[PDB]
Amino acid sequence: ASVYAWNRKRISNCVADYSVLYNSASFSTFKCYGVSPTKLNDLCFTNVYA
Amino acid sequence: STASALGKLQNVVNQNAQALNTLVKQLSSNFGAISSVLNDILSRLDPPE
């Protein structure tokens, strides 16, 4: 989508394996601010926004 | 018959209890950190921060 019409999606009721996202080298920049990227596999959230 | 004739001892007890209570309650403050509990703040961050 365009910059002024950025696409927003809500995610809930799932189990997420962030490890496969992190270990992949396809992404140029991967910056996690509030948490540590390697600790995502242990936490559980709700109402994730992408 | 008459009550509240021992105000001094009750005052001492109340002062000590209130001091202890406020000391305990101070443990829930934030002090500028992102949280007030060690367990959550340790299970979420790379140590350097």
From Swiss-Prot, chain B:
Q: Where is this region: Heptad repeat 1?
A: 1-31
**Coiled coil (UniProt feature):** 10-49
Function, please?
Subunit of the fusion protein that is processed upon entry into the host cell. Mediates fusion of the virion and cellular membranes by functioning as a class I viral fusion protein. Contains a viral fusion peptide that is unmasked after S2 cleavage. This cleavage can occur at the cell membrane by host TMPRSS2 or during endocytosis by host CSTL. In either case, this triggers an extensive and irreversible conformational change that leads to fusion of the viral envelope with the cellular cytoplasmic membrane, releasing viral genomic RNA into the host cell cytoplasm.
Q: What is this protein called?
A: Spike protein S2'
| Species annotation | Severe acute respiratory syndrome coronavirus 2 (2019-nCoV)
UniProt lineage: Viruses, Riboviria, Orthornavirae, Pisuviricota, Pisoniviricetes
Annotated gene: S
